[PDB]
Design a protein around this ligand. Sequence first.
Ligand SMILES: CCCO[C@@H]1O[C@H](CO)[C@@H](O[C@@H]2O[C@H](CO)[C@H](O)[C@H](OCc3cn(Cc4ccccc4)nn3)[C@H]2O)[C@H](O)[C@H]1NC(C)=O
Ligand SMILES: CCCO[C@@H]1O[C@H](CO)[C@@H](O[C@@H]2O[C@H](CO)[C@H](O)[C@H](OCc3cn(Cc4ccccc4)nn3)[C@H]2O)[C@H](O)[C@H]1NC(C)=O
Lengths: 133, 133
Amino acid sequence: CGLVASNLNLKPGECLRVRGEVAPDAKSFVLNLGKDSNNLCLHFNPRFNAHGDANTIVCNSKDGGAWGTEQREAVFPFQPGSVAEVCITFDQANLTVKLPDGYEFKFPNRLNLEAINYMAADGDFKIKCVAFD
Amino acid sequence: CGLVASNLNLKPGECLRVRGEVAPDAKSFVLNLGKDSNNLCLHFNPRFNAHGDANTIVCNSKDGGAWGTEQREAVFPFQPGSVAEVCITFDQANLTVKLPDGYEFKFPNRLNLEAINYMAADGDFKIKCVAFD
Ligand SMILES: CCCO[C@@H]1O[C@H](CO)[C@@H](O[C@@H]2O[C@H](CO)[C@H](O)[C@H](OCc3cn(Cc4ccccc4)nn3)[C@H]2O)[C@H](O)[C@H]1NC(C)=O
Ligand SMILES: CCCO[C@@H]1O[C@H](CO)[C@@H](O[C@@H]2O[C@H](CO)[C@H](O)[C@H](OCc3cn(Cc4ccccc4)nn3)[C@H]2O)[C@H](O)[C@H]1NC(C)=O
């Protein structure tokens, strides 16, 4: 279990940047953002080799303990054994996730949060820097 | 009120770097480090004007919920309404706190922590970046 941060008070339009090292033998990692562990406006889960999935980004939400409808993206800008940065913002409609190699996508904001107050990391990603703007 | 982080997994000799904004009207700010909120190897409290102190850094420990004996430092390289970086490392004997303008001091590792897993900020300091070397 990785870095957990609370009281982030990330407001709409503000950018959260996370840089970390993807393990050489990475199978998958997770960043979770929301209010708390039961209330996630974004579960961001790059799977290198996990749950039968290869090089696929899986996203979902969690509302009051309940997983939402999973979505998958079609580009995988991560390499095992490399440094990677992820930049996330939000407004009421969407979270915007910016990734390496120029890639960016939106994930619908399915929760009702005023601010993002909680982050949690897990899996094969060693966090080196977190910045809150 | 400020950022709280857990699972930091900071080990001896590793450097924790915290940058933030000292409020324009700053009276006092706090960085706490330790095992958890009740076991602090460092309560780092620069006081511009607070609790009977002017321009003084007060340091303490907290062991099983009980405050230790305060140590007052001899230097104060902080100003209201500025950016500041604090860098912290530790070993068996001491925490070393590096401050702006080349200042540093040591505070004894009273709890004999071999790992720092918790950090929390409070007061007139807005954390903008946290980095691990
Ligand atoms: C009959 C259809 C079954 O579909 C499958 O159902 C699985 C179980 O629900 C889906 O897997 C889950 O997808 C969720 C997002 O939709 C989460 O990713 C679930 O894992 C949550 C989790 C585990 N961990 C610990 C962890 C994570 C990464 C590395 C190391 C530890 N942290 N969060 C993950 O278990 C999996 O994505 C899903 N696959 C498909 C293609 O739909
Ligand atoms: C009138 C003289 C009595 O002596 C005073 O007794 C106080 C209470 O024990 C001493 O203050 C406490 O010292 C502790 C360390 O030894 C902690 O600094 C106590 O504050 C804990 C705290 C409050 N906060 C919230 C906060 C922090 C900064 C700004 C705004 C909110 N966070 N941590 C702080 O209230 C204060 O250090 C002490 N001063 C002197 C000069 O001896």
